[PDB]
Amino acid sequence: EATLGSGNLRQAVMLPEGEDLNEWIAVNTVDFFNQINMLYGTITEFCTEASCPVMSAGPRYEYHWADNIKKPIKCSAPKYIDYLMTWVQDQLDDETLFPSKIGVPFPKNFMSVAKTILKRLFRVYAHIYHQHFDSVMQLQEEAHLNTSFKHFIFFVQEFNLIDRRELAPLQELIEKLG
């Protein structure tokens, strides 16, 4: 439904002429991380071990926590998201993944790292929309969530950062933006 403005988000996600694709993906990814943990932060009271014993995205989707050949762990939504956000932040702080020093290149596998981060962030939106949209409304933050999400989706679509399959829990919503 509602968005914060009448700005053209499709154009705003586009790689500027002469810009470095890796740098562009990196700056935008940090932005989305920040947004999503702000947004989740506002409903964190309503997301409990009681309300959300699994990391759900409607009845068809149940995410299990994993990073190593490690066996994925079935866990509550607050836990899953805690683990996720800590993990993402740690990547963002890693100089070998996200170099800070001017002139220093991104690693060989950078695209893979970004994609991994972004597909995980997506899961947080999915949980919020399916399970906590009541709280969102209550807080009158539907315009804020919707705009953030719309932006996110356009970005990941533009740069082929998340597979259609991965977006499936929100396909209807995404199509409406289509």
Add this chain to the structure above:
Amino acid sequence: SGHMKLTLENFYSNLILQHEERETRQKKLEVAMEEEGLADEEKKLRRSQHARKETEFLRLKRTRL
């Protein structure tokens, strides 16, 4: 949450305006280059120089956080 709301509102307003401005800067650059009468190879060099500044800016923008 009021911080979230203000911060996102500001972000989206800025996001659009910055995008528009960036486009206009690119155009202005092209015009200036014709006006000055830069040869093709010179224009390439100039574009690249300017692009470097923009990408350095993006890095710092992330980095300073």
